[PDB]
């Protein structure tokens, strides 16, 4: 609004006139924050490719039949949405500001036409990012815990808790986005009470996971001694990957809610996509074992297909 205020004052002064007739701080913020801007941009960009590559493997391969692994792929859809949302909003904001610099403010047409759609998705992605961390914890509860029904009759509810929570709790913010704030992208810091309707759905998901986290760890540890057969099958593989993603992601914002701190948060948040991708799509044993199986076939095909001997006679034999 600083630029708009100058334009309004300049226009009023010009019409009225016709009727009558620290340097160092700007240098520091410009140079230093440029490094911070690219510090998290490279993390999201690297994770953006990794999430797409990991999603391509799951969808492309024939192992999509099993719902145990297919649920991971749809979780990756939330990470790629959040990573892309931050990337596009940074570019458009840079494009809008660069246009006002070299490429008298009303002349420019189109500043935040894509900011509003990107801002809601960025908020949509983060709240849904930890929403799918909730479904993974409860889904794993009925694999390693007591259960009788197969992996059925619960997939309908899984989509109702993944995107279901960011369907009646994010839309009130959409109304508040244009109403009582409307500050040029519906993203500001005027009142801290409006964040309470976003953080609480995230906060509720984190605490309820802690309720699941304590329950799941005590059930597995007690039953690990007798007949668990650790690391023998997929039962323990999911325990290693899931039980470390739940607390690491949850406490990232818990300590933040409670400029050195800013760098640590952005550095950790940028690599969240990389951490979830390697644990679920790369470090997992069956996807790793099957991945090299096709590599072996491709290598074997290349080597196989690369682009006066007298005749045999015969004689009689006495019986």
């Amino acid at each position: 609004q600083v630029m708009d205020f100058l334009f309004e004052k300049w226009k009023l002064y010009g019409d009225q006139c016709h009727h009558n007739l620290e340097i160092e701080v700007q240098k520091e913020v410009a140079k230093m924050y440029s490094s911070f801007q690219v510090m998290y941009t490279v993390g999201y960009s690297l994770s953006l490719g990794a999430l797409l590559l990991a999603l391509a493997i799951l969808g492309g391969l024939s192992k999509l039949h099993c719902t145990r692994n297919a649920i991971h792929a749809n979780l990756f859809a939330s990470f790629v949405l959040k990573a892309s949302s931050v990337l596009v909003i940074d570019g458009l904001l840079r494009t809008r500001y660069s246009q006002k610099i070299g490429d008298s403010t009303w002349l420019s047409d189109g500043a935040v036409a894509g900011c509003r759609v990107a801002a809601v998705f960025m908020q949509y992605g983060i709240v849904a990012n930890y929403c799918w961390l909730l479904v993974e914890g409860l889904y794993l509860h009925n694999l390693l815990g007591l259960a009788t029904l197969p992996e059925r009759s619960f997939f309908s509810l899984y989509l109702g808790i993944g995107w279901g929570a960011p369907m009646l709790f994010v839309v009130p913010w959409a109304v508040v986005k244009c109403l009582f704030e409307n500050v040029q992208c519906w993203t500001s810091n005027d009142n801290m009470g409006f964040w309470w309707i976003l953080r609480f759905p995230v906060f509720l998901a984190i605490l309820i996971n802690f309720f699941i986290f304590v329950r799941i760890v005590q059930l597995l540890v007690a039953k690990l001694r007798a007949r668990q057969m650790h690391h023998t099958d997929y039962k323990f593989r999911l325990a290693k990957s899931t039980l470390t993603l739940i607390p690491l992601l949850g406490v990232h914002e818990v300590v933040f809610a409670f400029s050195a701190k800013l760098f640590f948060d952005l550095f950790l948040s940028s690599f969240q996509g990389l951490l979830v991708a390697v644990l679920y799509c790369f470090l997992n044993k069956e996807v790793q074992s099957e991945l090299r199986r096709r590599w072996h076939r491709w290598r074997l095909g290349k080597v196989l297909w690369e682009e006066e001997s007298c005749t045999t006679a015969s004689s009689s034999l006495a019986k």
């Binding site: 609004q1 600083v2 630029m3 100058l6 334009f7 300049w10 700007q26 913020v29 410009a30 924050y33 904001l93 500001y97 006002k100 610099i101 008298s104 403010t105 993203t187 500001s188 810091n189 800013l262 952005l266």
Partner: peptide, 25 residues
Amino acid sequence: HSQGTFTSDYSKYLDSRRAQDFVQW
């Protein structure tokens, strides 16, 4: 957002540049 406020701080630099742009011309 914490970084969002810092991005809005850049607008003063553009506003200062806008004043210099009129001065230069």
